[PDB]
Amino acid sequence: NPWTEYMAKYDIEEVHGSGIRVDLGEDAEVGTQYRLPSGKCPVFGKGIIIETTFLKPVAKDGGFAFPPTNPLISPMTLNGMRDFYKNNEYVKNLDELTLCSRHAGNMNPDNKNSNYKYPAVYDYNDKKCHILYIAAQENNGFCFRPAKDKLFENYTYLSKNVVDNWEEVCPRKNLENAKFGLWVDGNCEDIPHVNEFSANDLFECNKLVFELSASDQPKDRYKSHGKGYNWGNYNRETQKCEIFNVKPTCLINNSSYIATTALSHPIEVE
């Protein structure tokens, strides 16, 4: 299988290792244990819909983000962060997503050393890192839910564990003229069983895959560890989002198709 190295980033269980729709793959104490995001990959286009937009600072007149601080460490621009850490050579040159993740992970709420590290959102639109004070992602029993949405397409959801080489080992772009397959005896075969959801465009397919992807809460017991319906083959001609839950191990050339994952950006292709 010559696809092995290339397909590694699509082994979402291995490279991400946590929930995607809802990421709560670890626990940390602050006396009391709390659930918190721990996925190793950035989630492109993921945001939180409040049923106040969620990047507003916490106060129900407030959102999910860090309250104002002195100095203001959230929200903080990329340049603001690089300046803040200008003396730290291990941090100052990190890519924007990892830096945002490390910046959020810098703020210890236990003022003893604790393992609790806030998740974050980097907004590519105005180059701002938003530390999330609230790590919750769904409450549909304040009612809210995670989603991919046009309003969120420049948002990126970042756990404390985002790896510094995510660009190399994590999905971002959708693959044009390509279909996920399974390598069997020297040939790339079709995913034998897929779940067909109609979708008007690639965005809607990406949205659907996200909705069905690995999730660490319903709607240790609940942890997905990255297992789930994380991949989709979008047939742009029949407008079918072909969703499946086993890792792909090769690509098939097919101009009718675009290959997407729950982690991938909902628009960008390569």
């Binding site: 002195n70 460490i73 850490y85």
Partner: peptide
Amino acid sequence: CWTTRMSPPQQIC
């Protein structure tokens, strides 16, 4: 109030 984990340690409120 939070405390930075990376040196230099500081208190940000």
